[PDB]
């Protein structure tokens, strides 16, 4: 049995799909998945043992010059790579018109996705052969597991979802695995950042432990913030630019992580690393992290400026006390 997954974006949503593959592999021996994913996240699906051919799309990049000749050629090539196999099922776990119309509609095989009432964009449901009702108010992980279970004809297991990607990293753990924490400071929107002074106070409060701290970055403004945080603290290292796989290796070796609500926090969750996520204006309810040792630190009044470094250190201490 060969299944095509359509689940293109964003980073966390791609990661959240992994436990559904693991469920399906256990219920259907020898099932294999191809996966249409945005090019920036193409590495993620390759880490799961049930995945064969990743089929990158670049919808977001194509939209700037959609009819430009090189773009028309990439689109053409994408359709050809999409239509190369006949799939036993095509599962659209995204539920957007972009995903349904630009990708799912063109693939060969029976097309499964969410119905009018449960899809993110209801009109996406017009493009499916098999519509499934997947209740909106559950964690993203559980929704996708339910969609896979209903699409492929097996009962949704009651056990906790298993991403099954940490084994891929078992063979490549950094040498200094266990001797550092990773601080994930970069996110999407000003009010979701923990103010810089609070990070630096936290870092300061860990002078006395002798722990090492590593700071990733994936764009210029993030590099500069990483440098301001590390300034004056010899136990803090600013990582060089790396691939998504590289930063995953780093996270896989971390004793623990402290993070804002961000893509790489969900990657941390997918790798089962202890993670303290700091939330203000976003609700850890449904798009909180799902996994082992994902801890939730709620800023007073939902405002991150009000959450002190002391309160976070104490939260770490209270949680280790297990």
Ligand X SMILES: CC(=O)N[C@H]1[C@H](OC[C@H]2O[C@H](OP(=O)(O)O)[C@H](NC(C)=O)[C@@H](O)[C@@H]2O)O[C@H](CO[C@]2(C(=O)O)C[C@@H](O[C@]3(C(=O)O)C[C@@H](O)[C@@H](O)[C@@H]([C@H](O)CO)O3)[C@@H](O)[C@@H]([C@H](O)CO)O2)[C@@H](OP(=O)(O)O)[C@@H]1O
Residue 250 binding target from ligand X, ligand GA7, none, CB below 5 to 8 Å by type:
none
Closest alpha carbon to 152 in 20, 6, 9: 20
Residue 112 or 216: which CB sits closer to ligand GA7? 216
Q: Which of 17, 22, 25, 94 binds ligand X (CB under 6 A)?
A: 94
d(CA 257, CA 274): 6
CB of 57 to ligand GA7, least distance (A): 8
Residue whose entry in the numeric block shows the structure tokens 């939330």: 279
d(CA 171, CA 47): 12
Q: Which of 49, 52, 61, 68 binds ligand GA7 (CB under 6 A)?
A: 61
Q: Which two tokens stand for residue 283?
A: 């609700």
d(CA 205, CA 184): 17
> Interface with ligand GA7 by CB under 6 A: which range of 80-88, 146-154, 161-169, 215-223?
215-223
Number of residues that bind ligand GA7 (CB under 6 A): 21
Residue 217 binding target from ligand X, ligand GA7, none, CB below 5 to 8 Å by type:
ligand GA7
Answer yes or no: are the C-beta atoms of 229 and 193 closer than 8 Å.
no
Q: Which two tokens stand for residue 320?
A: 């280790």
CB of 175 to ligand GA7, least distance (A): 20
d(CA 168, CA 170): 6
Residue 27 or 242: which CB sits closer to ligand GA7? 242
Q: Is 6 in the site for ligand X (CB under 6 A)?
A: no
Neighbouring-strand partners of residue 111: 90
CB of 140 to ligand X, least distance (A): 4
d(CA 186, CA 189): 9
Q: Which of 14, 96, 147, 206 binds ligand X (CB under 6 A)?
A: 96
Closest residue to ligand X using C-beta atoms: 9
Answer yes or no: are the C-beta atoms of 166 and 252 closer than 8 Å.
yes
Q: Which of residues 187-206 bind ligand X (CB under 6 A)?
A: none
Residue 78 or 217: which CB sits closer to ligand GA7? 217
Q: Is 216 in the site for ligand GA7 (CB under 6 A)?
A: yes
d(CA 7, CA 37): 6
Number of residues that bind ligand X (CB under 6 A): 12
Q: Which two tokens stand for residue 133?
A: 């009702």
Q: Is 88 in the site for ligand GA7 (CB under 6 A)?
A: no
Q: Which of residues 53-82 bind ligand X (CB under 6 A)?
A: 60
Residue 88 or 222: which CB sits closer to ligand GA7? 222
Q: Which of residues 130-149 bind ligand X (CB under 6 A)?
A: 140
> Interface with ligand GA7 by CB under 6 A: which range of 38-46, 144-152, 157-165, 304-312?
38-46
Q: Which two tokens stand for residue 8?
A: 């293109």
CB of 102 to ligand X, least distance (A): 11
Q: Is 287 in the site for ligand X (CB under 6 A)?
A: yes
d(CA 151, CA 134): 11
Please, which residues have CB within 8 angstroms of residue 186's CB and are 6 or more apart in sequence? Answer: 216, 217, 218, 219, 222, 225, 260, 262, 264
> Interface with ligand GA7 by CB under 6 A: which range of 74-82, 91-99, 127-135, 237-245?
237-245
DSSP conformation letters of 138-204: S-HHHHHHHHHHHHHT-PPPSSPP----HHHHHTT--TTTTSEEEEE---SSGGGSPPHHHHHHHHH
Site residues, ligand X (CB under 6 A): 9-10, 13, 60, 94-96, 98, 120-121, 140, 287
């Amino acid at each position: 049995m060969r299944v095509l997954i359509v689940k293109t974006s964003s980073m966390g949503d791609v990661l959240h799909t992994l436990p559904a593959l693991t469920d399906a592999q256990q219920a259907i021996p020898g099932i294999k998945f191809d996966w249409v994913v945005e090019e920036g996240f193409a590495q993620i699906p390759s880490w799961h043992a049930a995945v064969e051919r990743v089929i990158p799309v670049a919808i977001r990049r194509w939209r700037k010059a959609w009819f430009s000749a090189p773009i028309k050629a990439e689109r053409k090539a994408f359709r050809e790579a999409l239509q190369a196999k006949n799939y036993d099922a095509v599962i659209d776990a995204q539920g957007l018109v972009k995903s349904a119309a630009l990708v799912t509609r063109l693939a060969h095989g029976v097309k499964h996705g969410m119905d009018w009432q449960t899809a993110r964009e209801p009109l996406a449901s017009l493009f499916y052969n098999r519509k499934h009702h997947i209740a909106k108010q559950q964690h993203a992980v559980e929704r996708t597991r339910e969609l896979f279970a209903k699409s492929l004809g097996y009962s949704k297991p009651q056990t906790q979802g298993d991403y099954a990607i940490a084994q891929h990293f078992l063979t490549n753990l950094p040498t200094d695995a266990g001797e550092y924490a990773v601080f994930l400071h970069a996110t999407t929107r000003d009010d979701k950042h923990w103010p810089e002074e609070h990070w630096r106070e936290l870092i300061g409060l860990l002078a006395d432990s002798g722990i090492r701290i590593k700071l990733p970055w994936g764009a210029p403004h993030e590099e500069e913030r990483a440098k301001r945080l590390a300034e004056g603290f010899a136990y803090v290292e600013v990582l060089p630019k790396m691939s998504l796989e590289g930063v995953a290796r780093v996270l896989a070796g971390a004793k623990f992580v402290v993070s804002v609500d961000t893509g790489l926090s969900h990657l941390t969750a997918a790798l089962d690393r202890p993670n303290i996520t700091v939330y203000g204006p976003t609700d850890p309810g449904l798009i909180g992290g799902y996994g082992k040792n994902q801890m939730v630190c709620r800023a007073p009044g939902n405002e991150l400026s009000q959450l002190t470094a002391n309160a976070v250190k104490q939260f770490i201490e209270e949680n280790a006390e297990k």
